[PDB]
């Protein structure tokens, strides 16, 4: 019944910056509010109780503040380990009510891709079909182009990434991008790459190889 | 040593019922409270209901009501959450949490659980088919080397990728599964890994796909 809104819901920072969120109840909860911070995919980890209150191993820079509506969660000196989405719950009126998140995304100097790529393993060939895959390592901003091009020859309809999560220790996102064609048509061609082009590179970086090798 | 252990995955036809385990060890079972928290993927969290373990006494949400109806068997020490009337709405993951204290001022969550990842769906599971990808000469960047497996036409998600049985940690990339045009999911679990290691070193992936109940270990080289 009690809505809680939280701001801002995305947001970046540097590191060892104070940042602080804000979680306003739609009534007056009496401080009972507790603070909650998730990493992407992992279990949720209880940081404070009663929105002012420490949990055993909880940072010495994790703070809490407010009283009535309005509350807060600040950070000391914000860094690499702190990133996720912060999430607060209001535990005074039943049904207990959370609120729409706050991710926090680390803000770093601008990173190169390493650039692998692999050629097909020998076991899916004699299934009868082909997956190369091109590999971006530790790089940031997340924001970053591929372009798989097989004889010199743009191809576009059957390319697939995926980008994981910020690295929890270089605040780094690494991206992998799966081409998939048939055993015959990988066989048709000869030079196959992968254009990468991101903004910590002034020119696209391009990693090829023959079929033979 | 508290801990609570839940299923990594339950894979359910639509329709049909399920449970959910919380097995709690380590503790005096029958003093704490216990909080099951349902999370779909990318959105915020939902309160399901308050249980004690020890005395029934339950606390439902008003929209879980006629839907979710929690247990506890005093006897293996675990909770139970079970479902009813599953649709494609309910696929999602739900938590389970441990109360301090419970009804005082100073009440808070203080362990938490892994978490089911329910999948509601009514086609058939397949077993994943995992390749090398191995270490070239396209695959080193100045003194690393990069080497990976490719899990690949698998059903349904989540698979767990891991290296050298859990002996090596430092640099492992486990990219999200993406989602075929047939259906399917696959993804990669690449490692940076020193060059001049690459002799004398073994890299064996531990691919485990429970739900289908296949575990497949591909070691991968060079060449």
């Known amino acids: 019944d009690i809505k809680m809104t939280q701001s801002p819901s995305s947001m970046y920072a540097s590191l060892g910056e104070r940042v602080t969120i804000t979680c306003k109840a739609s009534q007056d909860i009496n401080s009972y509010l507790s603070w909650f911070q998730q990493k992407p995919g992992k279990s949720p980890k209880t940081l404070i109780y009663?929105?002012?209150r420490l949990v055993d191993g909880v940072p010495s820079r994790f703070s809490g503040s407010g009283s009535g509506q309005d509350y807060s969660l600040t950070i000391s000196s914000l860094e690499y380990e702190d990133m996720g989405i912060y999430y607060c719950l209001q535990y005074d009126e039943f049904p207990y009510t959370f609120g729409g998140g706050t991710k926090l995304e680390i803000k770093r100097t601008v990173a190169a891709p390493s650039v692998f790529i692999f050629p097909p393993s020998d076991e899916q060939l004699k299934s009868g079909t082909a997956s190369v895959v091109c590999l971006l390592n530790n790089f940031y901003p997340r924001e970053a182009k591929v372009q798989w091009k097989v004889d010199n020859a743009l191809q576009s309809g059957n390319s697939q990434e995926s980008v994981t999560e910020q690295d929890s220790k270089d605040s780094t996102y690494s991206l992998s991008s799966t081409l998939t064609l048939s055993k015959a048509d990988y066989e048709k061609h000869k030079v196959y790459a992968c254009e990468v082009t991101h903004q910590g590179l002034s020119s696209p970086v391009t990693k090829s190889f023959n079929r033979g090798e | 040593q508290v801990q609570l252990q839940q299923p990594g995955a339950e894979l359910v036809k639509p329709g049909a019922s399920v449970k959910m385990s919380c097995k709690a060890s380590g503790y005096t079972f029958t003093s704490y409270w216990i909080t099951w928290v349902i999370q779909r993927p990318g959105q915020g969290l939902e309160w399901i209901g308050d249980?004690?373990?020890?005395?029934?006494?339950?606390h439902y949400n008003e929209k879980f009501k006629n839907k979710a109806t929690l247990t506890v068997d005093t006897s293996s020490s675990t909770a139970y959450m079970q479902l009813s009337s599953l649709t494609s709405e309910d696929s999602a993951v739900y938590y389970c949490?441990?109360?301090?204290?419970?009804?005082?001022?100073?009440?808070?969550?203080?362990?938490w659980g892994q978490g089911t990842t329910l999948t509601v769906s009514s086609a058939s599971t397949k077993g994943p088919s995992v390749f090398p990808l191995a270490p070239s000469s396209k695959s080193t960047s100045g003194g690393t080397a990069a080497l990976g497996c490719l899990v690949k036409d698998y059903f349904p998600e989540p698979v767990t990728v891991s290296w050298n049985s859990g002996a090596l940690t430092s640099g492992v990339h486990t990219f999200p599964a993406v989602l075929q045009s047939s259906g399917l999911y696959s993804l990669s679990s690449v490692v940076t890994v020193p060059s001049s290691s690459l002799g004398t070193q073994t890299y064996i992936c531990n691919v485990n796909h429970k739900p289908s109940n296949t575990k497949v270990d591909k070691r991968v080289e060079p060449k």
């Open positions: 009663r929105a002012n």
């Open positions: 949490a441990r109360w301090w204290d419970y009804g005082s001022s100073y009440d808070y969550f203080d362990y």
């Open positions: 249980i004690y373990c020890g005395s029934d006494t339950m």
